[PDB]
RNA sequence: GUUAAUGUAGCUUAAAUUAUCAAAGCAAGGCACUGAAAAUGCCUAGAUGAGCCUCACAGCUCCAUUAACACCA
RNA sequence: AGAGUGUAGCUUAAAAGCACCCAACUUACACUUAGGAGAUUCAAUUGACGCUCUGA
RNA sequence: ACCUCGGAGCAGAACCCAACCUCCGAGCAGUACAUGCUAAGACUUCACCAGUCAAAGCGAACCUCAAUUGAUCCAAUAACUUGACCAACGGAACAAGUUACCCUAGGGAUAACAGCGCAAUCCUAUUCUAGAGUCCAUAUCAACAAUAGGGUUUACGACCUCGAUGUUGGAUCAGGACAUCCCGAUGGUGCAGCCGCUAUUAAAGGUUCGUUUGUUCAACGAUUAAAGUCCUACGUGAUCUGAGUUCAGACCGGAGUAAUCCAGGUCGGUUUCUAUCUACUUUAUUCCUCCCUGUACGAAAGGACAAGAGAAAUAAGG
RNA sequence: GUACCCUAACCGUGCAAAGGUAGCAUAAUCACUUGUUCCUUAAAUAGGGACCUGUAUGAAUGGCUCCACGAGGGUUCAGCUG
RNA sequence: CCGAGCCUGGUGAUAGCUGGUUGUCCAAGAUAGAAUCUUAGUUCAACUUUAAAUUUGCCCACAGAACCAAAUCCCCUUGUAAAUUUAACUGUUAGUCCAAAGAGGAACAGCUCUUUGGACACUAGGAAAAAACCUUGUAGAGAGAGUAAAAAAUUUAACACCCAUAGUAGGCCUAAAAGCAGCCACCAAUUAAGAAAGCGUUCAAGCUCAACACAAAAAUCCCAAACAUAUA
């Protein structure tokens, strides 16, 4: 398989793990801003 | 080498330009190619004035492509020489023309005719 | 990988985009005088040099 | 292709936040590492299988004193994913020839030079 | 349709790098075109190879290319350059280690 | 001429030498034609792909159809098809040379603008037929403004600054943290985990 | 899965649990400390 | 589909550079007129994209087309 | 009237180096080779002859 | 088509690096006639063979070109030297066709059949509204494209099998899928009724007989409520058949000097097994007639559903 | 080049030793080709009879009729029979 | 049993081809290539093994390697203990998948061909089973202990209500095209309704709107059982 395929190519599992570890975590505030005046 | 700070110390083809209409775009207005026809019946008076306009252009950094001649006509043969000029600024146009006017030796006629 | 140059590179300050308007060496001896002078100036790279290294007197003379 | 990896010098420039998380001093740093291999050399390239033989880390979970010099540290930067680096801290000093036979390296990384097996 | 092109590699390039000790006659760098030009105590063969003339240490430097005036191709490339332009080429030198001999006492006559 | 001009199937003089499929003109972020020049609204390429001549006819007919040429104009940002793609003749065995040149193709990388729009008109009159052309393209595409392009770029700058994940992809790949460069590319150091082949993950930091 | 589950064009998908995420994270924290002690 | 040859005036033959000639049509001439026989001209991007030289002139480049080949179950 | 000041054309040259002029080979330019003209504004770092500008 | 040598790309920066990969070339020409002799040190086309470079010295003077080539054999010549499109270019010798009369050794390293991979080709489903449909995108069909799915086809690959996995159709007996041809239940209609067209749902049951052809197909005859698309080793030959297709004979046309060949046609041509093990061996639909009624509907021509009754047919059980 | 119910010898310089004649013909005769049409069948890729671009028919590689003959290869009437 | 009988002899024909190659235990041990009537083989190299001699080997830092990307080469320190030479030979020279850079093909193949690196032909644990992915290598006994890799997460489409007079069928072009066939102008009444933004008329008329006001489908039979709530 080439490096550019027409389908989404299946990742190596150790590559699939750091795309799961380094996923974006949004900043969650302590109090929801719609619960504050 | 590529990974060293001395990369491209020996390159030179960007210092060599190895390989026309009237160019008046927005302010930098300049002519195209010019031709300067000088006709006289003396080969001595035509060849020697062909030098001086070429020496006047070289002293003013004006690009001279060709300096050839067209053949004679048997009237007595009138010798005609063409001096190709490109590029004059606004201030240069009246000044560069009036000195060739103010140096015409003996009955030779000028021309600012153009190409083809 | 590229590493930037340490000092100024040669043919850099004279480098322009117009090459027809710039006046040239037309000769070999004009280039060689500039070439010999540039070899004697100290440079930031390795070179061959690193490893293989009153008023009365004028008035009398102008009269003479 | 798969080549060796040049890790830039920016990665090994510690931030002042990092001196607070791990208890190190930038001025007067430690002298001796304690290197311990925690990953196998199998499924690793041959230039990491040989560096591990050069540092003596052929056995896993066996500590080894190495100097904190930029030539030993160049070998530890190759195989840093295989090992665990900790400073050898010395609460008492380095052992004399009388206290040479009563030492113990603890799991905190410290080398006690008097090791009885009696409680405090 | 595309026949030919099965030529092997020439194995050219630098045989003795920077700082290497090199005796007289050692080929320093074999090349196809003039990538490295000769310098001090380095000669050129017919096939543009660079061999060493003295026993010494190889150094690679960058200096000003002044071609020979009979070399009409490069001189016509020199005289198209702008007025501050200076060409450079990588030169290979041999820094000669030994002296060429000492004066030894033969006999008291 | 406020219309998309005719795009020809081939150049005037055609390419006589069969070029190899450099597939690296699809992968990665684009560098040419990423910003607006004499326009306001466009079609962003959120993924790489190849435009045949059929895509240019789709874009040219169904933009000139739904348009006011007295109030709108359009220009191309992708060139005419130049890269030759060579198909072997059907039902043949393997080997025996390289196939003859069949058709031509423009490569389009991710982040590339494809067409541009403009004139005395707003985005809501233009999101109609530019989001239907973007769906017919062989890559994931999007109708963008100048205001909604710089919004989605400054949003990802805000995603890259807010995230509570201590490990990003650039910190792990460039340091070779788990020996992870055994499973990555050399391209992944400048791709930073956002490009996987021809595709583009814009939610990834 | 058409042929040989883990190789080829169509493989069976493998997914990342909380085990495999936490195992890589605690190996990434030994690594971040490794970059600290080699920096001085 | 692969190998092989082919390219002509309005059409075909030829000429080994240069381009010949029988039909075709253009009129006039003999016949009451019309076909023939003469006596005259004409009609050739030599199928072509560039020119190493100069090229029907000869190799690439070629677009039509003509024969063989249109295996192997 | 005031300011800036000032080596031949230019010079963070100190009597210099480039620019510059003619003649011959060049259609001509260019190159080259033969030749050519050149200056520290005068008086003891200082003052007053000349130029540039801002004024009437 | 190719086989040797060289330049460039793949192979971006020491070297190297394949390909029936992509592009260019070479089998010489010219000028010298010290294009003499010698000799340190090296390079090396991944071995060897050959190929390169060279200071000093002797002797004089004051090679260009990327490739531009060919070993050994001792003879042709007095000697120095010279001799291959040995181009299959590390080179036997100048030795061809053919085999279905074939044989042997092997190979699943390697083809045909089947499985498998794959999905270009094929089939399908949605997205998009261009356009057809008087007007009207969406009753119906559908261009350019897009995103999915299937694994019927033509192909590709060469992974199991060549110490044998035996084939086209047919017979027999069928198992299954639903992407439904009929019967069932619904939504839409450019649905008045009758006929339809289209989609949702349903796999319980059913899905004909013949003439020509070895034919699957295909055409035609007569029917049917309908004469479904497929998969099952192109289901099933230790159940059967053998017309085609593969033999040994033979003409006919053509190719060849002939032997022989065509994939071109035609006549003829042995289908082996006593069952060891597994598995198994009694789990109601449809049509037509009549009636409703020539009513509803329709301007007519036409012409129904639902309910009811009777006749059949097949299937299963006797 | 021209036949003009698609039908004028009405002209034909290229050359070869000679340029397929009579007959038969979709043949056991490359493909095209289930060629065109009639009879035969309810239905005819079969069988028979006529027409010829049979551009690979053809005269002892023998051509064409006809009488007999055939465990030869096709087609058919009637009868008959699991 | 005749494409050339059968028997004996040469004959233990020859086979780069298949099959077979018999006590115990330990040790080292895998993939550059080139020539070849050669690619089913062999010779040389490379790799491997033993014995011997010696001195460096590997890892590497500044500096350095050309003009028309990842890295490598070279390289003292340093970490280390190996390497080169000499002597004697055998065998492997019919590889696979994965990651990466590419080529060919369809940016198809469990496809083909190079390169860099792994793993496999070697043990064990895991990914269900599993040569090639992940963890882990140096061997034994134990009814000890800490660990490594290691268990998939997702469930998605409501939406305005009200109201509509008027310069004028704006002119032109058009049989006439009036807000809507086309072009130009696009002002103006009342507090507020466009010389009209969708439908609709041969053209009109009518309807509204803007304006006031308030994702999935294939063939024997789905495929662990199950479970939202007890403290990392
Ligand atoms: Mg090459
Ligand atoms: Mg090679
Ligand atoms: Mg499988
Ligand atoms: Mg060698
Ligand atoms: Mg000499
Ligand atoms: Mg040979
Ligand atoms: Mg050979
Ligand atoms: Mg036979
Ligand atoms: Mg097969
Ligand atoms: Mg196989
Ligand atoms: Mg294979
Ligand atoms: Mg077999
Ligand atoms: Mg068997
Ligand atoms: Mg259904
Ligand atoms: Mg079957
Ligand atoms: Mg059976
Ligand atoms: Mg018989
Ligand atoms: Mg034997
Ligand atoms: Mg062992
Ligand atoms: Mg063999
Ligand atoms: Mg070293
Ligand atoms: Mg393979
Ligand atoms: Mg152990
Ligand atoms: Mg409203």
Question: DSSP of E42-108, one letter per residue?
Answer: EEE-TTS-EEESSSEEEEEEEEE----TT-HHHHHHHTTSBTT---EEEEEEEEE-S-S--------
Tell me how far apart the alpha carbons of residues D63 and D109 are, in angstroms, rounded to a whole number.
Answer: 10
Contact check, Cβ <8 Å, D11/F182: no
Structure solved using which method? Answer: cryo-EM
Q: Write the DSSP assignment of F125-191 as a string of letters.
A: TTHHHHHHHTTSSSS-EEEE-SHHHHHHHHHHHHHHHH---S--HHHHHTTTTTSGGGTS-STHHHH
Resolution (A): 3.1
Question: Could you tell me which chains touch chain B, where touching means 3 or more CB pairs under 8 A?
Answer: C, E
Domain range for F168 is 1-205
Contact check, Cβ <8 Å, C2/B16: no
- Alpha-helix residue ranges (DSSP H) falling in chain D: 18-21, 46-49, 51-55, 72-76
Tell me how far apart the alpha carbons of residues F175 and D78 are, in angstroms, rounded to a whole number.
Answer: 11
Question: Could you tell me which chains touch chain A, where touching means 3 or more CB pairs under 8 A?
Answer: F, G
In eight-state DSSP terms, residue D44 is S
Tell me how far apart the alpha carbons of residues E51 and E37 are, in angstroms, rounded to a whole number.
Answer: 11
Residues of D in contact with F167 (CB under 8 A): none
Please state the domain count of chain F: 1
The C-alpha of F23 sits at a distance from chain A's nearest C-alpha, in angstroms, of 6
Count CB pairs under 8 A between chains D and G.
44
Tell me how far apart the alpha carbons of residues A14 and C35 are, in angstroms, rounded to a whole number.
Answer: 58
Nearest to G25 among A10, A16, A21 (CB): A21
Element holding G19 (H helix, E strand): helix G18-37
Give the pairing of strands E88-96 and E36-38: parallel
Beta-strand (E) ranges in chain G?
Answer: none
The C-alpha of F174 sits at a distance from chain A's nearest C-alpha, in angstroms, of 13
Report the chain G residue with the minimal C-alpha distance to residue F175.
Answer: G35
Q: Distance from the CA of A31 to the center of ligand 5, in angstroms?
A: 93
Domain range for E31 is 3-109
Residues of F in contact with D8 (CB under 8 A): 174
d(CA E10, C1' J41) / Å: 22
Phi, psi of D101 (to 5 degrees): -95, 10
Nearest to B10 among E80, E81, E87 (CB): E87
Q: Kindly report the CATH number assigned to the domain that includes residue E28.
A: 2.40.50.100
Residues in chain G: 40
CB-CB contact of F38 with F75 (8 Å):
yes
Within 10 Å of residue E88's Cβ, how many Cβ atoms? Answer: 22
Is the CB of residue B26 less than 8 Å away from at least one CB of chain E? no
Q: Distance from the CA of E57 to the center of ligand 8, in angstroms?
A: 85
Please state the domain count of chain E: 1
Q: Which residues surround ligand 3, an ion (CB under 5 A)?
A: G 3
**Are C and E close enough to touch, i.e. 3+ CB pairs under 8 angstroms?**
yes
């Amino acid at each position: 398989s080439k490096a550019v395929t027409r389908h989404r190519r299946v990742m190596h599992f150790q590559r699939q793990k750091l795309m799961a570890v380094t996923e974006y975590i949004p900043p969650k505030p302590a109090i929801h801003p719609s619960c504050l005046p | 080498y590529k990974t060293k700070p001395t990369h491209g110390i020996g390159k030179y083809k960007h210092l060599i330009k190895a390989e026309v209409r009237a160019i008046n775009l927005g302010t930098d207005y300049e002519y195209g190619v010019l031709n300067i026809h000088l006709t006289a019946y003396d080969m001595t008076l035509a060849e020697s004035y062909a030098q001086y306009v070429h020496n006047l252009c070289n002293s003013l950094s004006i690009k001279v492509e060709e300096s050839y001649a067209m053949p004679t006509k048997t009237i007595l043969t009138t010798h005609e020489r063409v001096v190709q000029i490109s590029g004059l600024s606004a201030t240069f146009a009246e000044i560069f023309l009036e000195i060739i006017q103010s140096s015409l030796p003996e009955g030779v006629r000028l021309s600012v005719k153009e190409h083809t | 990988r590229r590493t930037p140059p340490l000092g100024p590179m040669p043919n850099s300050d004279i480098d322009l985009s117009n090459l027809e308007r710039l006046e040239k060496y037309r000769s070999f001896d004009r280039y060689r005088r500039r070439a010999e002078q540039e070899a004697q100036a100290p440079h930031w790279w390795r070179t061959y040099r690193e490893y293989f290294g009153r008023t009365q007197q004028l008035l009398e003379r102008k009269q003479a | 292709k798969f080549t060796r990896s040049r890790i830039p010098e920016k990665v090994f420039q510690a931030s002042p936040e990092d001196h607070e998380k791990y208890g190190g001093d930038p001025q007067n740093p430690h002298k001796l590492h304690i290197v311990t291999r925690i990953k196998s050399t199998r499924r690793r390239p041959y230039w990491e299988k040989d560096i591990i033989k050069m540092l003596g880390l052929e056995k896993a979970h066996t500590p080894q004193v190495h100097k904190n010099i930029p030539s030993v540290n160049a070998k530890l930067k190759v195989v840093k994913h295989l090992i665990r680096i900790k400073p050898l801290k010395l609460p008492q000093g380095l052992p004399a020839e009388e206290n040479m036979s009563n030492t113990c390296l603890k799991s905190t990384g410290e080398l006690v030079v008097q090791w009885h097996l009696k409680p405090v | 349709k595309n026949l030919g092109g099965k030529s092997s590699g020439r194995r050219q390039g630098i045989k003795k790098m920077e700082g290497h000790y090199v005796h007289a006659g050692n080929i320093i760098a074999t090349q196809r075109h003039f990538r490295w030009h000769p310098g001090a105590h380095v000669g050129v063969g017919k096939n543009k190879c660079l061999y060493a003339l003295e026993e010494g240490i190889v150094r690679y430097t960058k200096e000003v290319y002044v071609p020979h005036p009979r070399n009409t191709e490069a001189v016509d490339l020199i005289t198209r350059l702008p007025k501050g332009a200076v060409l450079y080429k990588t030169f290979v030198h041999v820094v000669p280690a030994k002296p060429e001999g000492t004066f030894k006492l033969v006999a008291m006559l | 001429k406020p219309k998309l001009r005719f795009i020809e199937r081939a150049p005037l003089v055609p390419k006589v030498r069969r070029e190899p499929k450099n597939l690296s003109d699809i992968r990665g972020p684009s560098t040419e034609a990423t910003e607006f020049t004499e326009g306001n609204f466009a079609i962003l390429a959120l993924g790489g792909g190849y435009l045949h001549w059929g895509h240019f006819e789709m874009m040219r007919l169904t933009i000139n159809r739904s348009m006011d040429p007295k109030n709108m104009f359009a220009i191309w940002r992708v060139p005419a098809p130049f890269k030759p793609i060579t198909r072997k003749s059907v039902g043949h065995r393997m080997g025996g040379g390289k196939g003859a040149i069949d058709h031509y193709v423009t490569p389009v990388k991710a982040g590339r603008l494809v067409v541009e729009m403009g004139g005395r008109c707003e985005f809501e009159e233009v999101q109609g037929f530019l989001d239907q052309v973007a769906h017919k393209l062989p890559f994931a595409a999007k109708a963008v403004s100048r205001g909604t392009l710089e919004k989605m770029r400054k949003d990802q700058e805000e995603r890259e600054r807010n995230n509570q994940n201590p490990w990003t992809f650039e910190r792990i790949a460039t340091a070779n943290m788990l020996g992870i460069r055994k499973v990555l590319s050399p391209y992944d150091l400048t791709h930073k985990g956002k490009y996987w082949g021809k595709f583009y993950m814009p939610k990834r930091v | 899965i058409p042929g040989r589950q883990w190789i080829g064009k169509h493989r069976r998908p493998r997914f990342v649990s909380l085990r495999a995420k936490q195992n890589m994270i605690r190996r990434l924290e030994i690594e971040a400390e490794n970059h600290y002690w080699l920096s001085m």
